[PDB]
Paper text:
The gamma-tubulin ring complex (γ-TuRC) is the principal microtubule nucleation template in vertebrates. Microtubules are formed de novo in a process termed nucleation, which is spatially and temporally highly controlled by γ-tubulin complexes, composed of γ-tubulin1 and associated γ-tubulin-complex proteins (GCP). In most eukaryotes, microtubules are templated from a preassembled γ-tubulin ring complex (γ-TuRC) that determines the position and direction of microtubule growth. Here, we used cryo-EM to identify and characterize γ-TuRC assembly intermediates after recombinant expression of the complex, which allowed us to delineate a comprehensive stepwise assembly pathway from a stable 6-spoked core to the mature 14-spoked γ-TuRC, identifying successive stabilization and conformational locking of γ-TuSC units as central principles in the assembly process.
Extensive 3D classification revealed a core of six γ-tubulin-GCP spokes as the minimal stable and most abundant entity in this experiment. This 6-spoke assembly intermediate was resolved to 5.3 Å resolution, sufficient to unambiguously determine the identity and sequential arrangement of spokes based on secondary structure features of the GCP proteins. The cryo-EM density of the 6-spoke intermediate revealed that the first module of the lumenal bridge has already been formed by recruitment of the MZT1-GCP3 module to the GCP3(8) GRIP1 domain. Since only one copy of GCP3 is present in this intermediate, this clearly indicates that the MZT1-GCP3 module of GCP3(8) (rather than any other copy of GCP3) is involved in forming the lumenal bridge. Surprisingly, the outer surface of the GCP3(8) GRIP2 domain is associated with an additional MZT1-containing module. As the only MZT1-GCP3 module present in the 6-spoke intermediate was already stably recruited into the lumenal bridge, MZT1-GCP5 and MZT1-GCP6 were the only other candidates to represent this additional MZT1 module. Notably, GCP3(8) and the adjacent GCP4(9) subunit create a structurally unique binding site for this MZT1-GCP5 module, which likely explains the specific binding of MZT1-GCP5 to the outer surface of GCP3(8), while MZT1-GCP3(8) remains available to form the first module of the lumenal bridge. The overall stabilizing role of the GCP6 GRIP1-NTE is further supported by direct contacts of GCP6 with the GCP5(10) GRIP1-NTE and the GRIP1 domains of GCP4(9), GCP5(10), and GCP4(11), effectively bridging all GCP subunits of the intermediate. Taken together, we conclude that the GCP6 GRIP1-NTE plays a central role in the formation of the stable 6-spoke intermediate, providing a structure-based rationale for the effects of GCP6 truncations on γ-TuRC assembly previously observed in sucrose gradient sedimentation experiments.
Author numbering:
A (entry chain b): 11 to 75
B (entry chain H): 245 to 278, 285 to 347, 361 to 505, 524 to 545
C (entry chain J): 210 to 336, 357 to 388, 391 to 410
D (entry chain L): 282 to 304
E (entry chain a): 7 to 105, 113 to 129
F (entry chain G): 150 to 191, 201 to 387
G (entry chain I): 1 to 63, 79 to 202, 256 to 285
């Protein structure tokens, strides 16, 4: 009703905090990409696997350019 | 008695402030609890025991106007360093509402080393001003700990700004001023007629800096003496005619020395 | 129901009439301060002293202060007893302990008397000397642009975070001029 | 979807009589 | 959310390409995500907080090690996330410097004295 | 305790007689040696009358106290207040099983205290730039030991750490802190400083190569000690 | 509470902190809702806002006592040195709206740098009252404190000192070109040299007097 829309507000400010922790660690994600990354980690998956995925996918758009 | 009370009290005694069941009776004894928790509590409160000393010393010397510019820079430095510790503490208050990580021992472990050093630095600069103070911060740059060397090298860059501002008035114009004794030249109160050159300027050897040798001080004294004789007698006037800086003293004093004597 | 509901919901009206005001808030002392202070006073055995301060919310205080600093009269807050505008001590917000409130409304009432006496002088020519008339015209010319500045600030309240301490520093380059 | 919808502008009305979550 | 579409959307975010133009990168994604999909080491956000602090002491920035503390505080104050371990460990793994010894570092619990 | 007061002054006289181009060498203040709470090493009911499955929880909490220096309630750190030696006493009324299991975990306490003395006495300026860089890289591994014990403390808090898991967990860190304690003993006994404790590390790096875990420890320590040289 | 502090540091004492003109902002009340040690924190914090009141009282009375346009230049600079103390008090209430966990320690932290400005400028405000300075010698008495020992009071007075030189470029502009003096009263007769600061030498003053007297002829 009322709390179910302020709860996702309480998601947004945490999503803004991680937007600082992303840029002080120099990551290739932006704000839209990190939203998908939180949707990945809530279901449960090794982040070494995702990190190896992006560590290949980023080298497969500048190796063709 | 519960642990939750002593955790709040030990959170207060990091600032230097007694708790509700932690009190301070003798100033040379550490903070006492009013059984295992009581034994654990003392090693953390050693920090507040030293904090009272380091706060009181930079309180007294900063408001003392006989202590001079050199060293009030050191007080400003120590105040900037205690600031960042309170930056830690203000966050550490909010991190409760477990936080007791071996009762915050791993939290206080890195401040314990950044506070032993300022406790050494306040006592090795005790009652000392000028170059005696500059040598006393340069002495702790002779350590072999890289974290400690990087820590003390910043405070030395703070203390060496007043002396280098005193240097750049002494080379360029020949003017000398102090109402204290922190500079390496000691001017004569008599303001002589043509007996100036031998007697107006004398070397203060007690306050030669910890980056200047005796050779450097004498060689720049000759230049300042000449450019003062050029103004107070010869009446000529020409504008724009005159820590380590990685060997930039030995070039600037070298250029100024040539210019003043050839024109004289 | 039909008309009384449209009144009761959307119009403020509780505090400038004789009616106990109900106001929800986020309790726990930092803005529940008046109630905590009353609880401490009653726990320390007063004995009774049944204080009746009805209640007001905070922003309505801001707009009545702006209307007083404009120069118009007849507001609920700020009673006056001889022609000098003073604090009404019948009110509490949820904080300010009734002593910080009594001081800050006194400070702005001090400028209220400044603007009130000069609008009284301006009224005594509007209902024949021809230099006094030019003098009051000069003050009127200052006052109309002054009232424009506060009136445009008041429109931005209907729409930023505003409190009392913000609008006094906002009116600083003019309240210095009014003195 | 929820985080594509996250990107609307924050509120500008703040309450000081509500210190915990005043939208 | 469905995992397969979530990976090929990642392949569509980093490559500047449509979702009918990429199937080769998502095939590599299936190769790595399958056989490392369940935990192989125990979860602890405490350790990865002290290993982000380990990165920030490696650059001698104590003030940013205390900024990470207020950020990590806001993460707990809200509490709308369930797996707090993975996203911070992921962010830690992609660290760069904005300006040996790794067998002397400590390790987390192997999930061999515990059920996998 | 008492004997450390000689060494610093004795070497200070040598370095004071050597140096006449500069005076007033820095040293720590007096209370830095005086207080026993700058280091980690210094109501009660008998454990014997307790049941066994409460005894296990009680003893593991006591041993986790002993690892970081402070005493447990049922095992006492014996007061000697002298050299790299330190002994510990558990009570004789405990059941014989848990004590035989405890006794093999106890030496990592003794190779924590003996290291700790070397960080306080051998960081002064009569031991020089090389021993300061040696000591400033030995404190790092102590900090990593603090990290390990804080995580196992968290696991024990929720009732999920037992002695049989703990015994397996501490063994690599036991080996590290044993390397540190043995090297601290060797530097302390010969009264070594200068390049004589960079010849010592060149031999000691070859000496321990059991799994190449410790070989990389002393490989980092010789890089750390050779930076001021 | 944390806005109740923000009015204590401003000019509103309230009932909690009782102002006195011998020792103001006092609290000796017992609080079931605050910790016993909290008082200690407030006591140290009490040293800050007290001075902000006293400075404020000094700005109200000024602008047979003291007179001068020199006192209308020290005060104007004292406004500007208090301006970031206004801004860093407006920032706090903005921060407090969302965050409920910001205790008193963050205010002590953020306004720690005003426990070095305020005590080193309060001696300057006490100095002119203990010994009366009303002529042109205010520039020396401020100019020895701008050298200072600490960086905040070193710049804070230089902001004040520039306008004290600026009012001295209205006298030395009307005199030297238009032959006008005593359009504003001080504190042939053309004298100003006794109250002129001693780092300004005699030669430039004897030049100024002759240039000013030549316009009359």
């Amino acid at each position: 009703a009322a709390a179910a829309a302020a709860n996702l507000n309480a998601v947004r400010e945490t999503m803004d905090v991680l937007l600082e922790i992303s840029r002080i660690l120099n990551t290739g994600l932006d704000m839209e990409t990190l939203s998908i990354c939180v949707r990945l980690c809530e279901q449960g998956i090794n982040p070494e696997a995702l990190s190896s995925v992006i560590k290949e996918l980023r080298k497969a758009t500048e190796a063709l350019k | 008695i519960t642990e939750a009370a002593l955790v709040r009290d030990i959170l207060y005694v990091f600032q230097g402030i007694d708790g509700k069941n932690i009190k301070m009776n003798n100033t040379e004894n550490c903070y006492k609890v009013e059984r295992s928790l009581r034994d654990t509590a003392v090693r953390l409160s050693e920090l507040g025991w030293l904090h009272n000393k380091i706060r009181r010393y930079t309180d007294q010397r900063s408001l003392d106007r006989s202590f001079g510019l050199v060293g009030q820079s050191f007080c400003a430095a120590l105040h900037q360093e205690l600031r960042e510790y309170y930056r830690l503490l203000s966050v550490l208050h909010s991190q409760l509402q477990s936080l007791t990580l071996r009762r915050l021992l791993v939290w206080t472990y890195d401040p314990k080393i950044r506070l032993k050093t300022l406790a050494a630095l306040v006592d090795h600069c005790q009652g000392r001003k000028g170059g005696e103070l500059a040598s006393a911060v340069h002495a702790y740059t002779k350590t072999g700990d890289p974290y400690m060397r990087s820590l003390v090298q910043h405070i030395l860059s703070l203390v060496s700004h007043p002396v280098l501002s005193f240097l750049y008035r002494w080379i360029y114009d020949g003017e000398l001023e102090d109402t204290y004794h922190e500079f390496f030249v000691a001017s004569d109160p008599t303001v002589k007629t043509d007996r100036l050159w031998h007697d107006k300027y004398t070397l203060r050897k007690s306050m030669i800096p910890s980056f200047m040798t005796m050779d450097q001080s004498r060689k720049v004294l000759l230049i300042g003496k000449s450019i003062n004789f050029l103004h107070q007698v010869c009446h000529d006037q020409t504008p724009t005619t005159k820590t380590d800086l990685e060997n930039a003293f030995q070039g600037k004093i070298d250029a100024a020395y040539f210019e003043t004597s050839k024109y004289l | 129901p039909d008309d009384r509901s449209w009144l009761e919901h959307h119009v403020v009206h509780q505090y400038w009439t004789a009616r106990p005001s109900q106001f929800p808030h986020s309790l726990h002392l930092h803005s529940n301060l008046a109630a905590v202070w009353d609880q401490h006073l009653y726990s320390s055995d007063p004995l009774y002293v049944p204080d009746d301060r009805v209640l007001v919310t905070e922003t309505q205080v801001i707009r009545e202060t702006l209307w007083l600093l404009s120069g118009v009269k007849k507001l609920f807050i700020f009673q006056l007893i001889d022609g000098k505008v003073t604090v009404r001590n019948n009110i509490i917000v949820t904080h300010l302990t009734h002593s910080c409130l009594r001081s800050v409304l006194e400070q702005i009432a001090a400028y209220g008397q400044v603007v009130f006496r000069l609008q009284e002088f301006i009224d005594e020519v509007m209902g024949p000397f021809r230099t006094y008339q030019a003098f009051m015209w000069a003050l009127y010319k200052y006052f109309i642009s002054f009232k424009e500045e506060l009136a445009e600030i008041e429109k931005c309240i209907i729409n930023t975070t505003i409190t009392l301490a913000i609008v006094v520093d906002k009116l600083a380059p003019r309240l210095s001029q009014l003195k | 979807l929820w985080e594509a919808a996250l990107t609307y502008e924050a509120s500008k009305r703040r309450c000081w009589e509500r210190v915990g979550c005043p939208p | 959310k469905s995992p397969n579409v979530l990976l090929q959307n990642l392949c569509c975010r980093i490559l500047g390409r449509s979702e009918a133009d990429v199937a080769q990168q998502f095939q590599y994604a299936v190769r790595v995500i399958g056989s490392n999909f369940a935990p192989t080491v125990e979860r602890d956000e405490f350790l990865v907080a002290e290993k982000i602090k380990k990165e920030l002491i490696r650059q001698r920035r104590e003030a940013d090690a205390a900024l990470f503390s207020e950020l990590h505080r806001k993460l707990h104050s809200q509490g709308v996330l369930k797996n707090k371990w993975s996203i911070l460990y992921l962010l830690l793994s992609l660290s760069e410097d904005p300006r040996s010894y790794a067998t002397l570092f400590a390790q987390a619990l192997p999930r061999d004295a515990h059920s996998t | 305790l008492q004997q450390s007061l000689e060494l610093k002054r004795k070497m200070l006289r040598d370095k004071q007689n050597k140096k006449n181009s500069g005076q007033h060498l820095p040293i720590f203040p007096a209370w830095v040696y005086e207080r026993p709470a700058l280091i980690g090493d210094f109501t009660a009911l008998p454990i014997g009358t307790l049941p066994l499955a409460s005894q296990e929880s009680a003893v593991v909490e006591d041993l986790l106290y002993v690892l970081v220096g402070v005493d447990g309630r049922y095992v006492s750190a014996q007061p000697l207040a002298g050299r790299q030696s330190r002994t510990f006493l558990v009570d004789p009324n405990l059941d014989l099983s848990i004590r035989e299991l405890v006794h093999r975990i106890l030496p990592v306490a003794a190779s924590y205290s003996a290291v700790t003395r070397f960080i306080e006495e051998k960081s002064s300026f009569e031991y020089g730039q090389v021993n300061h860089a040696l000591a400033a890289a030995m404190r790092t591994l102590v900090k990593e030991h603090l990290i390990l014990v804080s995580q196992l403390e968290q696991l024990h808090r929720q009732g999920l750490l037992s002695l049989q898991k703990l015994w397996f967990y501490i063994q690599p860190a036991m080996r590290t802190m044993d390397i540190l304690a043995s090297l601290a003993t060797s530097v302390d006994k010969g009264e070594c400083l200068g390049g004589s404790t960079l010849s010592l590390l060149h031999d000691r790096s070859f000496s321990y190569t059991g799994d190449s875990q410790a070989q990389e420890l002393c490989l980092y320590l010789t890089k750390a000690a050779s930076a001021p040289y | 509470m944390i806005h109740e502090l923000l009015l204590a540091l401003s000019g509103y004492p309230g009932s909690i902190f009782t102002w006195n003109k011998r020792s103001g902002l006092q609290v000796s009340q017992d609080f079931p809702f605050l910790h016993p040690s909290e008082t200690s924190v407030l006591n140290r914090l009490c040293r800050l806002g007290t001075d902000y009141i006293r400075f404020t009282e000094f700005i109200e009375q000024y602008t047979g006592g003291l007179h001068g346009i020199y006192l209308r230049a020290f005060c104007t600079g004292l406004d500007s040195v208090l301006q970031p103390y206004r801004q860093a008090l407006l920032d706090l209430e903005q921060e407090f709206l969302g965050d409920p966990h910001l205790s008193i320690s963050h205010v002590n932290y953020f306004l720690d740098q005003f426990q070095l400005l305020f005590p080193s400028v309060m001696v300057v405000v006490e100095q002119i009252k203990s010994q009366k300075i009303h002529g042109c010698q205010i520039l020396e008495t401020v100019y020895k404190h701008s050298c200072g020992g600490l960086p905040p009071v070193r710049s804070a007075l230089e902001k004040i000192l520039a306008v004290c030189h600026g009012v001295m470029y209205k006298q030395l502009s009307a005199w030297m070109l238009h032959g006008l003096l005593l359009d504003q009263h001080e504190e042939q007769f053309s004298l100003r040299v006794e109250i002129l600061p001693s780092y300004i030498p005699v030669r430039v003053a004897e030049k100024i007097l002759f240039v000013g007297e030549s316009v009359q002829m």
